């Protein structure tokens with residue numbers, strides 16, 4: 001189809017994007033320097049979505065590495081797949097961007113968003129058809145919520161027609177170096193919700209919770225977490241990298257999954273919970289997998305599916321396994337507890353299967369859901385932020401950089417409006 | 430000796446087209462290279478077979494039809510395939526971006542952009558014709574480039590050719606192959622502006638057709654190359670009268686007039702009970718009588734409904750070879766059992782039966798095979814109210830809370846037309862429950 005632009009900022013999106021790209025480029029199997037390593041043509045049928053030919057009919061992706069701590073360039077080049085990125089999209093500020101808005105949100109880097117917009121434009125020109133933007137960052141601190149959200153403002157200003165997707169990373173007290181996060185979070189959603197299309201609440205909280213309770217790692221570093229996220233997002237992308245019945249596309253994904261123009265906080269999950277183990281280990285079978293799809297442990301966000309009604313349900317399946325039995329299982333899950341699936345929309349669930357197995361395991365599934373249940377995350381942000389704000393804290397920083405307090409109050413009002421709206425939409429019939 | 434025009438809109442309308450036109454061409458024996466044993470090497474033909482083919486200096490019989498598809502997928506396959514060579518060169522149109530499950534894009538953003546080129550091709554190709562009875566269109570409900578493009582195209586065409594006709598062969602939504610859930614919105618949002626120009630339509634419910642293929646064709650994965658072969662056989666049967674040669678149901682005008690009880694209500698059910706397992710050698714034996722003996726059951730119809738709970742208007746048929754009209758009238762005597770039949774007081778009833786003498790010619794090695802006989806009931810039964818009622822139920826359930834409305838509202842049409850279209854179909858179903 002058309003072409004899309006990939007955006008990675010901050011540290012989680014910069015490093016996490018690197019690992020994701022590693023995973024996908026390996027499964028699609030093209031050489032780091034671009035020799036054709038793929039072993040079937042079906043691999044290369046759509047790979048133009050995220051890879052582009054060089055001067056010698058050789059794949060070079062279309063991605064943009066943006067950040068402001070100068071150390072990201074070396075840290076990225078020091079990964080496995082760090083070299084292959086285009087040696088002109090490494091646009092970096094050198095003065096550091098310690099986790100404080102309005103230094104990059106307002107003060108500097110507003111100077112540099114012109115440069116990033118110029119480069120992304122000149123990049124997309126040769127894209128024969130433009131399909132949208134792929135932005136990865138973390139709702140945490142400065143860069144990843146500052147430059148990223150300003151960039152969203154600019155791109156929505158310039159390219160209204162195409163769609164905008166966000167992969168969002170929510171920090172939490174368990175693994176949280178800094179302290180000012182809730183301020184940054186609410187400051188970020190108050191622009192995201194009014195300037196995006198659909199979201200991906202890739203929670204750290206429950207994801208660490210998995211790494212530490214059941215996946216049994218007492219020292220989850222930035223190693224393991226990027227493992228899980230690269231797996232999840234690569235799975236999310238496969239519905240697109242492959243052909244299928246539900247050949248869901250960006251616009252189509254939205255319109256099938258977005259009931260109301262605001263409530264687009266998705267809840268990605270993953271059924272074969274995994275370590276970075278040298279072994280697949282756990283045989284996973286489909287009747288079990290379908291049950292696993294809704295497993296509380298399985299999800300990447302802090303919520304209970306049982307306590308929630310799904311606005312829309314989408315599923316993707318992988319490997320060589322019988323298609324008919326899966327459908328049978330899906331009908332079965334819908335029947336036993338009718339409430340979990342919302343009454344408003346009949347037949348919300350959509351099922352497709354992909355021929356190639358995920359590289360590593362035999363047969364699995366990649367969840368992409370959207371319940372009202374997503375409200376629990378936003379309630380934790382609400383509580384934490386409003387507690388830290390009932391009395392002032394650090395507010396001199398933001399204020400003296402040019403902020404105010406009415407922006408904070410309006411952001412918190414926006415948030416609690418959103419959560420009220422979710423609560424209401426999960427109680428009609 | 431009466432030409433016509435065919436058309437295929439969307440990737441669903443082009444797939445049906447592809448699965449059908451091989452049946453058409455092979456049915457006459459027209460191969461991509463074949464000599465078509467009844468020709469003159471320059472325009473040789475004008476029998477009912479050539480009534481759809483225009484011959485070049487090579488005596489090529491290139492179809493007077495187009496494939497339309499803004500997102501290029503199936504059409505690209507046609508271009509690689511020999512089928513494009515068989516088709517008239519450059520007649521087909523290739524697009525760039527579909528509306529993707531939203532009627533308004535194909536009706537207010539995307540469809541209008543290329544609709545003029547489409548109608549330009551229509552006009553240029555049409556003026557090559559002289560004896561066109563009407564239009565044969567293939568589409569279904571799903572997106573604005575597959576349901577909205579149709580609506581707009583019918584608007585333009587009905588404006589351009591006031592005298593001419595257009596027959597609809599549309600595909601009905603089903604939960605089982607759901608590639609969206611805006612689909613019911615699409616269906617309503619089209620049919621509410623389709624009756625005003627259409628005059629004769631055909632809905633083949635994939636739901637029921639899926640039920641067929643899963644059970645009695647012994648295919649357990651409903652691939653878009655199983656249902657399509659079966660449905661393409663349906664199309665060959667219904668087109669058979671016009672397409673092959675002289676018999677009953679000569680004309681599209683004849684279709685209308687022997688199926689329309691009222692200009693609005695032009696939804697005829699189609700029936701095709703006689704089926705076979707597969708290329709499998711032998712299962713049993715079967716004669717001309719038994720097949721219509723079993724053409725009554727409610728589970729042998731292209732759309733889920735109980736014909737026993739309704740009354741008919743008119744019922745034509747076709748038969749293939751092996752003539753025995755005496756036993757046909759014997760079947761007429763048998764069907765008086767009335768256990769699933771009932772008619773209307775004021776209107777005279779006709780079980781019109783016409784004959785054609787060709788055994789069913791089909792694809793080399795599909796999920797079906799050779800048999801000796803068949804018959805297809807074209808009942809414009811009032812019972813189709815069931816489908817519209819179920820679709821209304823689903824529509825109201827989804828519309829109680831303004832679902833997805835912005836995904837149409839911001840796309841160049843207002844909201845309230847939902848309500849007027851809903852009441853429009855309410856009037857139509859009122860007309861059903863009244864008739865009788």
Ligand SMILES: COc1ccc(C[C@@H]2NC(=O)/C=C\C[C@@H]([C@H](C)[C@H]3O[C@@H]3c3ccccc3)OC(=O)[C@H](CC(C)C)OC(=O)[C@H](C)CNC2=O)cc1Cl
Pocket residue numbers: 679680682683686687688689690742743776777778779
């Ligand atoms: C829905 O319920 C029913 C519907 C129809 C029937 C009987 C059904 N229809 C009529 O309405 C009969 C006569 C009127 C007239 C209509 C009202 C006006 O267009 C006419 C016309 C004008 C100029 C030129 C040609 C035609 O049609 C016809 O002339 C066509 C002949 C042509 C189209 C093959 O009709 C037939 O005779 C053919 C051989 C098929 N059958 C019928 O005999 C019974 C029932 Cl119960």
Ligand SMILES: Nc1nc2c(ncn2[C@@H]2O[C@H](COP(=O)(O)OP(=O)(O)OP(=O)(O)O)[C@@H](O)[C@H]2O)c(=O)[nH]1
Pocket residue numbers: 438439440441442444445498499500501527528529530569570571572573574575576600606608635653656657
């Ligand atoms: N060929 C075919 N199509 C089917 C079948 N069952 C359902 N469809 C429909 O195929 C349609 C896909 O074509 P469109 O409706 O034109 O889709 P669109 O998004 O408007 O545009 P394109 O995908 O570019 O065609 C969907 O609406 C499905 O409902 C089937 O058995 N065969």
Ligand SMILES: Nc1nc2c(ncn2[C@@H]2O[C@H](COP(=O)(O)OP(=O)(O)O)[C@@H](O)[C@H]2O)c(=O)[nH]1
Pocket residue numbers: 009010011012013015016069097098099100138140141142143144169170171175176177178204222225226
């Ligand atoms: N680097 C990294 N950070 C993560 C990840 N998951 C969550 N985080 C959190 O994201 C925040 C990092 O924000 P960052 O993008 O570095 O802000 P910056 O300093 O402005 O670039 C910290 O709170 C991390 O705990 C991950 O996988 N990688």
